[PDB]
Structure 1
Amino acid sequence: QQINLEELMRTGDYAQITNMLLNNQPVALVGALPFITDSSVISLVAKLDA
């Protein structure tokens, strides 16, 4: 699924996201975003990204 971030921080977030995050459900996000590069594989196995 999806959820425009632009409209999010505008609308004020209706815990829609808050709920999905809490409950763990496959989802996507959209808009401008800060990436962050890592290396030491480790990080991955440890699944830091979650």
Structure 2
Amino acid sequence: QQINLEELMRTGDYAQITNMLLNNQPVALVGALPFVTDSSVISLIAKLDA
């Protein structure tokens, strides 16, 4: 699924996201975003990204 971030921080977030995050459900996000590069594989196995 999806959820425009632009409209999010505008609308004020209706815990829609808050709920999905809490409950763990496959989802996507959209808009401008800060990436962050890592290396030491480790990080991955440890699944830091979650």
Please state which band the TM-score falls in when normalised by the shorter chain. over 0.9
Superposition misfits of 4+ residues, deviation over 6 angstroms: none
Q: Write the distance in 1 (CA, Å) between the matches of 2:13 and 2:35.
A: 22
Q: Write the distance in 2 (CA, Å) between the matches of 1:2 and 1:41.
A: 29
Give the unaligned 5+ runs of structure 2: none
Q: Does 1:13 align with 2:8?
A: no
Matches within 5 A, 1:17-36: 17-36=17-36
Q: Write the distance in 1 (CA, Å) between the matches of 2:36 and 2:20.
A: 24
Structure 1 residue 12: Cα displacement: 0.0
Give the unaligned 5+ runs of structure 1: none
Structure 1 residue 9: Cα displacement: 0.0
Q: Write the distance in 2 (CA, Å) between the matches of 1:3 and 1:29.
A: 6
Structure 1 residue 35: Cα displacement: 0.0
What do you get for the CA RMSD once the two structures are aligned?
0.0
Structure 1 residue 14: Cα displacement: 0.0
CA deviation string 1:17-47 (max 9, x = no partner): 0000000000000000000000000000000
